[PDB]
């Protein structure tokens, strides 16, 4: 019961970044993207019209994560600076300004993801993940246990649990409320560079630098499926699921996104077209578009 | 469609400022300083530490990190500056390990490395006194002979430490990137202009390959 060939193709090109793109996030409206690049700018794209909606200058040009608040009001970014910045988009003054600069991490920030518009969970290279209250700027909860840099985060659909990936080659699942590790299974041979949740919250897929992905479920305590081919020996930079999981889009350092069949573990397609390592990859909320950013400075919308 | 066309004006307005800002975020040369611990990193001029400087009206922006894996972010820099004091031995082989890890890193194979052999004074005075023997740590040094006021005693040893680093360089790279060794003292003002000359070579070399003259 395969899915044949998913001959997806470019439908837009969101040109405008002057440097390497590192992260983007789809707004809940399924229209607005926020993209972060080393140029030092956050650009709010209107995918439908290829229109730039906001441009947000940043204090630190070394961004490595970005987020779009589910309410659509706030966007967050993080990077080598140990401060996570929350920006307010619906300012009555018209311009976007910072609301809180979340200091407190000992190392670089690798992933940030809002939570119900008032709590933001971030992971840093100092081997810690943290949950914050944006208003006060304090760490409501601190997560420890990694033996290395934490590189990626993914919020569950319910937002009660979130998973982290670190360079210790283990995937750690955490509780926002209970504040201690629930699962820490391992199995990768190298750094876990990216993490994403399956739409049901019971699974998440790991992207590792050993050129192999793995599909984990909390009940299994082990990898269920592993995605790799002998002709691909480059690390995975980003991962995102499809609206029903079938279409596991994954970014690779070889300048193309391998479109893996989540259930079948077969390379059912390739969204080639990028001139450099494809870094970030995200599917819309409605499942109607997959936006792919790369170090080529181009964001492409595929359908 | 009147309101939607007004959004196009805002979209093109943003692109105008991005390229306006993108013409000054370029034309400055990013540099990464990966000197080893207990060295003269801060002498030759948030988690990230920056030090801007400019010679001949070219703006340099050097970056340091106190808090391996983030190195992938720096595959655009003009060069990497690896600073090691040439006076210690118990971690000099450790310093050579550090250089190899940078020279052979996947994302750095297109990046030249400027190597600063700082604290030559300490090495010069140290071997001149001879209170400790190099051969105890580098037995192969006993076979070395020089290839070139000026002291001929320690200069025999001075080029050995450079020889050790350059040997790690020519063993790989294959012309995609080059290692530019240097000797310096932590009083010298020449540290700034050495990098300027060295980045001109790196930039000139980059043109030679992307314009098909090599």
């Amino acid at each position, epitope marked *: 019961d395969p899915v044949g060939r998913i001959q997806m193709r470019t439908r837009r090109t969101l040109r405008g970044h002057l440097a390497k793109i590192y992260a983007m996030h789809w707004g809940t409206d399924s229209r*607005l993207l926020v993209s972060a690049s080393q140029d030092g700018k956050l650009i709010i794209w*209107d995918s439908y019209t290829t229109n730039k909606v*906001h441009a947000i200058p940043l204090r630190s040009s070394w961004v490595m994560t970005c987020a779009y608040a589910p309410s659509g009001n706030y966007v967050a970014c993080g990077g080598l600076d140990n401060i996570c910045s929350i920006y307010n988009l619906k300012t009555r*003054e018209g311009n976007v300004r910072v609301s809180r600069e979340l200091a407190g991490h000992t190392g670089y920030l690798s992933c940030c993801r809002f939570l119900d518009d008032n709590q933001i969970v971030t992971s840093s290279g100092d081997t810690t993940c943290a949950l914050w209250d944006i208003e006060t700027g304090q760490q409501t909860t601190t997560f420890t246990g990694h033996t290395g840099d934490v590189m990626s985060l993914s919020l569950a659909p319910d937002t009660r649990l979130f998973v982290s990936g670190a360079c210790d080659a283990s995937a750690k699942l955490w509780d926002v409320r209970e504040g201690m590790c629930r699962q820490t299974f391992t199995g990768h041979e190298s750094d876990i560079n990216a993490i994403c949740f399956f739409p049901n919250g019971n699974a998440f897929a790991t992207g590792s630098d050993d050129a192999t992905c793995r599909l984990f479920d909390l009940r299994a305590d082990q990898e269920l499926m592993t995605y790799s081919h002998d002709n691909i020996i480059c690390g995975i930079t980003s991962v995102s699921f499809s609206k029903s999981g079938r279409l596991l889009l994954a970014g690779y350092d070889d300048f193309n996104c391998n479109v893996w069949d989540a259930l079948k573990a077969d390379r059912a397609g390739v969204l080639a077209g990028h001139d450099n390592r494809v870094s970030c990859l995200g599917v819309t909320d409605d499942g109607m578009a997959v936006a792919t950013g790369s170090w080529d400075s181009f964001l492409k919308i595929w359908n | 469609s009147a309101e939607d066309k007004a959004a196009v004006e*805002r979209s093109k307005m943003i692109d105008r400022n991005l390229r306006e800002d993108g013409e000054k975020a370029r034309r400055e040369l990013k540099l990464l300083l990966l000197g080893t611990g207990e060295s003269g990193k801060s002498t030759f001029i948030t988690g990230i530490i920056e030090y801007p400087f400019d010679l001949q009206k070219v703006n340099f922006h050097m970056f340091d990190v106190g808090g391996r894996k983030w190195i992938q972010c720096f595959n655009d820099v003009t060069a990497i500056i690896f600073v090691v004091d040439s006076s210690d031995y118990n971690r000099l082989q450790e310093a050579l390990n550090d250089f190899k890890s940078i020279w052979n890193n996947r994302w750095l194979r297109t990046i030249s490395v400027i190597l600063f052999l700082n604290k030559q004074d300490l090495l010069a005075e140290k071997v001149l006194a001879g209170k400790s023997k190099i051969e105890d740590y580098f037995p192969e040094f006993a076979r070395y002979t020089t290839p070139e006021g000026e002291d001929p005693r320690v200069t025999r040893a001075k080029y050995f430490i450079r020889k050790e680093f350059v040997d790690i360089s020519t063993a790989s790279g294959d012309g995609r990137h080059i290692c530019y060794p240097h000797f310096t003292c932590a009083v010298d003002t020449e540290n700034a202009r050495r990098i300027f000359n060295d980045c001109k070579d790196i930039i000139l070399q980059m043109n030679l390959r992307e314009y098909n003259l090599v």
Partner: single-chain antibody
Amino acid sequence: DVQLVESGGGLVQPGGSRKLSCSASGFAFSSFGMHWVRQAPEKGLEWVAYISSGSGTIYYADTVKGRFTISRDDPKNTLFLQMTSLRSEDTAMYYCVRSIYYYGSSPFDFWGQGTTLTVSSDIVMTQATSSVPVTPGESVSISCRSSKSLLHSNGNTYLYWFLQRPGQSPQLLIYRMSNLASGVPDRFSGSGSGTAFTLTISRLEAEDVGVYYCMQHLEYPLTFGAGTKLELK
């Protein structure tokens, strides 16, 4: 907070000329486009001119085209409108209005207090409910009609609703036919389809009294209906 104050009005002798000035304060006026709007003393509203965020596009009302000259000075957060020659029908109140256009925008969010310039010596919006008595606790609903369907294929519908309370500048109630603007209580909501539309209110409050106004902003010129004056009793 946001605030726009304008001046330059006053009585004008026959054959004169005047410049209205709108001084923005407390917001990124450079990022907003500017509109001028007119209200006759007892004969409804009327659009005047338009200058965009970046003076790449300009528009004027037919009754003033050429005579007027809309100008802005972004670095000083000031807007102008140079008026050339004089005509008796120019007698009316003028208002300064801000609008910023991006996907989720709410054009016409803020209005100045206006400056009087009384003188002495295109799609059509319409609403049959010129005036109606109302009492507290009712759920009165107003209606306005269009000469062309406003549902452009985008799904956008550029009909607007405002409230010019007594002695007060208009405040944006519903933008793009259904959307609730900033500072507007939950009481208000626009609904319908196609060409005629209902601005519904529940639990009418004493502050919900004045003269409502409906305009269609599919394309320039912009046109007003006579509005709806509410007599509270």
